[PDB]
């Protein structure tokens, strides 16, 4: 998994990935326009 | 145009006075096809006096000159006062604009008040206890 490993259980890379990434790599939030709590 | 002898060409002038600036906008009698717009704040540099009578006078003179160059000789008047949830009375420049237009040389057709009053009343700015000075 792209999120595996480390000494503290963190991701270590931005979790929003682009629409064009190959199959074994699109694993976080796919082509997200926005993150965080919605306020409307 | 090609007017016959003794018959006039009319336009509609939309006056807008709002305690901060003064618009003078002239179209044909359909609303579309705007002709002139001088807006008053193009005649001073002080960021105040934009609503002064002098600026409205200069704007009206410019409107009259361009209108005479275009071929229009008569004017209908629709007066506005910015009145939505804001103030319902026209600003200080309206009288100066009207008088300058009347003394310009144009013929005046009809006068109307078209301030957008609500029967509806969305809530007004500066909630209760008002604007405190």
């Amino acid at each position: 998994h792209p999120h595996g490993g480390g000494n503290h259980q963190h991701i270590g890379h931005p979790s929003t990935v682009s629409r064009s990434a190959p199959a074994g790599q699109k694993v976080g939030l796919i082509a997200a326009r926005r993150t965080g709590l919605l306020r409307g | 145009p090609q007017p016959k002898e003794g018959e006039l060409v009319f336009g509609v002038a939309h006056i807008f006075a709002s305690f901060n600036d003064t618009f003078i906008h002239v179209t044909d009698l359909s609303g579309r096809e705007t002709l002139v717009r001088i807006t008053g704040g193009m005649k001073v540099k002080a960021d105040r006096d934009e609503s002064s009578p002098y600026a409205a006078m200069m704007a009206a003179q410019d409107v009259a000159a361009r209108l005479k160059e275009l071929g229009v000789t008569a004017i209908h008047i629709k007066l506005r006062a910015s009145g939505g949830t804001k103030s319902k009375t026209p600003g200080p420049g309206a009288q100066s604009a009207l008088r300058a237009l009347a003394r310009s040389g144009l013929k005046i057709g009809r006068i109307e008040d078209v301030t957008p009053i609500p029967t509806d009343s969305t809530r007004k700015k500066s909630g209760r206890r008002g604007r405190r000075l």
Partner: protein, 210 residues
Amino acid sequence: FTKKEWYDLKAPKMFLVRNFGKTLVTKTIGKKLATDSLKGRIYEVNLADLNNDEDQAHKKIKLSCDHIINRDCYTDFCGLSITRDKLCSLIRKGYTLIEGHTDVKTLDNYHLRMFCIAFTKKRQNQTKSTCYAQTSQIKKIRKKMVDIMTAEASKVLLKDLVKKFIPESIGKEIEKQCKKIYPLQNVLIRKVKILKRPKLDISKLMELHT
């Protein structure tokens, strides 16, 4: 930029002047036919300039153009209004005003709203300050207004309805037929909204212009 040409505006033969101004438009360009820019415009005229008498200085008339011969537009009927200051001058403190609206269809399958308005009167032998009416009387009056509008409008035709608007016959009938409930002062049709038109037929439209 001003490379523009002028056209003439013309009104149907119900009115009297038939030539009430001019309009501008930009010359034709590729796929810019210069007549798809003119048709559908709305013009609002005072009706004291349409019939040449100052008694009807209120009652603005809305006219809309549909068909364009070479340099003319033909501009048939679209709506009504009442010139706000006239409305404001009719409202004083001590009286009560009645108001109602309805939907109606003509024999040509036009759809409209009509928006009447009314006020109460004095019956001078009274020597009292106010002229208020009870709610039940108001309900009866309003029902009468709605029924009379429906009959008068659904009875005949669009052109005849327009000819009926000019001398304010509907107000006279409403006022006469409501005298037994409470005397009423000046009664007017305040606004007509055209709601749906059947179909554009050029022969009829040009029949309106002889």
